[PDB]
Amino acid sequence: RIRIRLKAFDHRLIDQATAEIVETAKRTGAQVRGPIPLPTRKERFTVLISPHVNKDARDQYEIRTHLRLVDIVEPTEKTVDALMRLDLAAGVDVQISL
Template identity: 40%
Template sequence: MKEDIYITIKAFDCSLLERCVKKFIDELKRSGAKLSGPVALPRKDSKFIVNKSPHVDKKSREQFEMRVSKRLIIIHDPTSTMMQMLTGLSFSAGVEVELRVKTKRAV
């Protein structure tokens, strides 16, 4: 059976995310991987509204917003050296990497 590795990279800072994705793709191309991506996934926006003071000035509030940007990279038919390289890569603080392995069924 053949395998695909789905790599989701998330970060709060979009410029930091782009630098990490570029570094990641350069490393994969250097190892000779067949890949698809990066695909920009929808950004998730979260808004928080907090009272400034619970007793005095109850109508006074602060608003905060958190934006999470995501990219998807798919590696087709990875080798064992690519798997070792993936586990050995380190990223900047604030960048989250998620790996999922999916097997393709032969038809």
């Protein structure tokens, strides 16, 4: 009866990790929906370009935080069991909740 989450920073890894979860969730459930989105976020920051003084010279860094609710059609006991051992590479973050 559970619900799922996927969170990342890479614009392609978010889909490659989706394509791991919705397949692990389909291997024990025949009815399909495909992935649902939201929420996406962005963030930018500045730093001094050199380690000693040089405080007028700076460089621009940014990130884009990607998240999917994904949705699972049958969250059945046999299907959540496959998600207790979810691997799925490093570089993303997930949840299982009720």
